[PDB]
Amino acid sequence: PFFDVQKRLGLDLDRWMTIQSAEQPHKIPGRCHAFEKEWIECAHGIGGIRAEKECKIEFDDFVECLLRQKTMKRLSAIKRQRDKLIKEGKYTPPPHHLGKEDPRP
Amino acid sequence: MFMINILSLIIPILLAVAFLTLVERKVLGYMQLRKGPNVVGPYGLLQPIADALKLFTKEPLRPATSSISMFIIAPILALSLALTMWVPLPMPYPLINMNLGVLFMLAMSSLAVYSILWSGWASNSKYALIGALRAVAQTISYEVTLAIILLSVLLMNGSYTLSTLITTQEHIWMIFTSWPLAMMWFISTLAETNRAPFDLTEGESELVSGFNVEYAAGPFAMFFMAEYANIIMMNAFTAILFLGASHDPHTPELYTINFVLKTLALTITFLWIRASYPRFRYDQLMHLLWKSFLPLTLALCMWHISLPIMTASIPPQS
Amino acid sequence: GYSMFAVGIGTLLFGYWSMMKWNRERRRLQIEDFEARIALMPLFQAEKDRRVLQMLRENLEEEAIIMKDVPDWKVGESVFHTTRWVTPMMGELYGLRTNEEILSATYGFIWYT
Amino acid sequence: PGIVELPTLEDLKVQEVKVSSSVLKAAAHHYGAQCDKPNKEFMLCRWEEKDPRRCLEEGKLVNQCALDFFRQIKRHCAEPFTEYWTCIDYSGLQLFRHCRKQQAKFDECVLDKLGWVRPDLGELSKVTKVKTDRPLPENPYHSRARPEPNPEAEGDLKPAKHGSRLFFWTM
Amino acid sequence: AGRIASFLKNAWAKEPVLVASFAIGGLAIILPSLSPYTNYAIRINRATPYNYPVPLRDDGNMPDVPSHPQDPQGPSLEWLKNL
Amino acid sequence: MPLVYMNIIMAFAIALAGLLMYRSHLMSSLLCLEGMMLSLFIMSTLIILNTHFTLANMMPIILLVFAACEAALGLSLLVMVSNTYGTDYVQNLNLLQC
Amino acid sequence: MNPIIYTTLIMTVMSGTMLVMISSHWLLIWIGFEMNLLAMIPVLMKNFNPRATEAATKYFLTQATASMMLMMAIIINLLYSGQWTITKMFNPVAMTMMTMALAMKLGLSPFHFWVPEVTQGISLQAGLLLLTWQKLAPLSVLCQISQSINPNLMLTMAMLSILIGGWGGLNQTQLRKIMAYSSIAHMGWMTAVLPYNTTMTILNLLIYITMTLAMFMLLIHSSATTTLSLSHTWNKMPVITSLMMVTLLSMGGLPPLSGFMPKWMIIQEMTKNESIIMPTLMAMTALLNLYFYMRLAYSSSLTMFPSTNNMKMKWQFEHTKQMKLLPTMIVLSTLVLPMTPALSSLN
Amino acid sequence: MNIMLTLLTNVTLASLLVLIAFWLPQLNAYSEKTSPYECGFDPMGSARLPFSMKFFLVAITFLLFDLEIALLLPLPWASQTNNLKTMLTMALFLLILLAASLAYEWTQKGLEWAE
Ligand SMILES: CCCCCCCCCCCCCCCCC[C@@H](O)O[C@H](CO[C@H](O)CCCCCCCCCCCCCCC)COP(=O)(O)OCC[N+](C)(C)C
Ligand SMILES: CCCCCCCC/C=C\CCCCCCCC(=O)O[C@H](COC(=O)CCCCCCC/C=C/CCCCCCCC)COP(=O)(O)OCCN
Hints:
The structure is cut from a larger assembly and holds 8 protein chains of 8 kinds. With about 170 residues, chain D is mainly α. Chain D has 5 helices and 1 strand, in the order αααααβ.
């Protein structure tokens, strides 16, 4: 079913391309390199069954970096509250958020 | 100010196409011991204006059996793509500066063929269908060779950016390093623009008018404009690719003059070639591209991959 | 035939020699300007750090003002369990700004031609 | 999940370097020769800490070193340098090669007034060593404790008691 | 020796395109392994600094790492200028 | 997720549905197969670019290579079916039953 | 077809399967499936005729659809975790799509319609290949991702496969369609035990491949593809029909024959996981396969059908070609039950 | 954003030329005039009948050789790598199998058109 010829011969036929944290050209990093490094090191050698429970924190952080679902939710909440308080005139946006900032290098 | 530049590029190109028609008529005339247009305007200068005005005041007809939507779309696509193919050409600066300008040229050219195919099919006429199938065959004949020739020539350049070709040739024309690829490329551009002896799609002797036989008036003039624009565009590209003109940053007009002279020479060479030779049979063109050009092109691609490594001559800008 | 082939091969060899010299010089020039970029990079990194941190602080203060009435909202609460620094998402940095800055930040380089 | 700590806008202030990219490119080689020490300190901080919030003082030292460098240039020959960076600035790619006379004049100027030698080809790209008092960060990833492994295999291998024990087989 | 002679004769007489193609392909295959400059090309590619050279923390036990770019230790590109 | 991702997955579903529901011509089904490949190429490219997995930039090209092989395979079979029946209709191939 | 070309194509089919079996990357597994299909289409049409063309066309359409679905599942899995390694799928929707794609590649019910038609449309050698070697790759992939798969969908498709194999086999007089429905039911048995013990899947697959190779080689040796054409073999080669009779009973799963071992092992493993009901259904339904095997044995070996006069001429000629592994295959198909504890070497 | 403006301008100019061509001149369309052209006479069959393709095999081969171009276009960038011996070996290997597939179809009469 899975004859691990690569591991028996030490070949690396396709393992160079399986993960995002593995030796990219010119050392260009993946967007989620640290999260994946952490999740891989947390779950290494403990087996699949233990890794899903005991490394769920690292994997949840990794998935958040990948898809950013909670970040978009928080931004949407903030902007809805801003829209609501602006419509009634309660809140006034600062100049550096309207296009009149003092830009810095 | 950018629309000013767009119009600055387009209005002149259409005028140059108009007068390329006159230059071709006169050059073929003098090679045939006659004169060509010398009556409408001094030295036939007003002949293109008369032709255009005559074509756009004549009745355009939609064939009864034709698919009207594709019938009308095909010339629009032809002319709009012919105009679009000019925007990345560095003369010495391009209107649009692209990282992959050569590859954009390839894709737009490859899309240009559909207008001929669609127009022939939309017409629902026998001769139009025969012309369209000849166009299918022509693309199959030259498409693979043309791309690999560009790749081989471009290896020395280091990228697909068209403006880098000026720096690549600061001291020598790239034709002194690849004149075999230059020969095969010239013939492939003859085939790619449907020009004698490779102009099978029109098939004037064989199919009367080929794909555009049904077309009349303004729609017909649009196909004509597109073809002649493509003839100038291909030659200009050939000039930039194989005969780089020295460019002075503080005086780009010198580069512009040099570049225009070289593209005019190549266009006149197309006209000369048309005046000199018999037409290729369409099956023969495929044999010519697949049994002679493709083996040499594969070998020369191997050679041009190996050569910069053998000699430590690999170019910059990965 | 010999003469034609000989002229052709001689032309090719001259061209090869010239291009070899010119491309070696070009590679030296590329190394030189790459090294200029290398000498300049620390200053750019320092001011990029300060710019990112300032934008995040401004967003934090505006969010402290905007989200005061909502009952159970921690201002500046992270969405990650980890406590290490996370590179800010583009939306977070420019979330509360004008559409022109957001366009320039997302598509400015892609569209520049 | 915890609040993100950010520096106040006061601690993010610095005397900026407000010269354009052509000026920076015209000065880059001598600037990398002269201000190497604080720049390398800052980059080592930056790449060991993996947090921009932990290397603000090094960045401010980077700014002050750049400003001192440019003040020296302004004090000893602004005119050859201005010639040089104007030549550089005309180019749309900002190419060093089209300006060799101006670069030569600027280089002689700095060599005679300040004793500045332009680095040779291949030197600014060396990996160098930095001596620092900053302690090496221990857990820059803020890692959790790793879970314990499974115990291990141990002991001598004895034949299975009563063989396979499949329904009726005695071996 | 004489079989292949007349064979290449007939090929040059009947299919010079294929003859030239096989010659150019074979040269492209074999010549790069006999060249003294292939290593020069590898070295030129290795000397191109695409990314920032991250400095090392000095521990007092690095005699061959420079402490300033213009120090004599580290790689040299002198071979490249004379190339 | 983003609106763009939803649209590409919808394109795959529509092409899959098109392949599943046959009409008369075989060529139309072959086109649907190509459409599925096109949507897979776009989806994988978007995911790869977004997460900056650098080495995975080559897998959409491999995808295209195999897609071309499949397309070529499909056209060969169509040539043989048309040579048998003078038509590329699905209804003609009913010789074998269950 | 040139013999060298045929060898190259068989080697490409096998190398695509081996690529599926040795790869750690989902893209390489997909490439293995693609290469296998590419080389396999010409092998179906080796003997050209409209039926072979139709069979290859139905096969290509089914397998290419499965391939697109498989790729889509891989891409969704990557979207929800930046992973290319084939371990356990991260997304439930990707797992459903993957399971259905592999079921279509195997021909499990309700995707079973293609197997009888394609098998009938091709020669006996191509049918042998299609029903033995073409199962290894999807089964190995399913064995790797077994923990991730949902039991309800898998067991539904497996029970459907057993039922539909039996019912469809009851109606056939063509031997290739009988073999195809047999294969469908056997696949159902292999996949029913997959979420519990992949070693039982491997054991079932090995015994099924042995019995199927024996049956196809016996059908080639006596060049028959219908029931009535096989009814003549007694009047030319009685040993062949006796051996086929015993092989047929082994397929039926009757003890003390080898064919009974996989059924026996699978039922026992399932009972351990507190699943009494599914197995009772499976065995009582395999009774149908046994019925139509017994019908074929009645017409072929246990009675003597009338014959023709021209058979006398065939009496005078020996078989030109002899199969080297046919004798071994029969012995392994019938007499291997006393060696059952050797299954531990499979895990 | 500039390329979008360029494409819009070009398509708009061409469409306006078509509009002028159809709305400026006098129109006198009748059935005889709008009928299909076949050199003096009425066509026998339809132009939508199947039109046999004698180069059908070169057309399928073009599909596979066109994807060889997608694998060879990154070669200018591949030349910048450090292990040039592996890159050159791989690039050479790719073109050799492209030459062998051309030699196979050529020697098996696959480039000859159907008769
Ligand atoms: C280079 C590209 C750009 C060039 C720049 C110029 C852009 C030109 C755009 C193309 C149109 C020019 C075509 C020239 C002729 C006009 C065609 C048409 O528009 O005119 C008539 C349009 O008239 C309509 O038939 C009905 C008339 C009124 C319709 C009511 C519309 C609402 C207006 C309300 C009236 C109140 C005053 C409006 C002004 C404020 C059509 O009549 P018709 O005979 O079939 O067509 C043949 C035209 N002939 C005779 C010249 C040969
Ligand atoms: C090791 C180098 C490999 C890489 C380089 C090659 C890359 C691309 C070149 C190869 C492309 C494929 C070539 C396919 C060969 C087709 C052979 C064939 O059948 O054509 C023959 C024509 O060619 C032949 O005669 C058959 C082979 C004869 C020899 C051809 C060249 C073999 C090698 C010659 C040179 C040897 C090496 C070069 C040494 C040069 C001297 C120093 C028949 O012609 P038709 O078109 O059918 O004519 C129809 C009308 N009558």
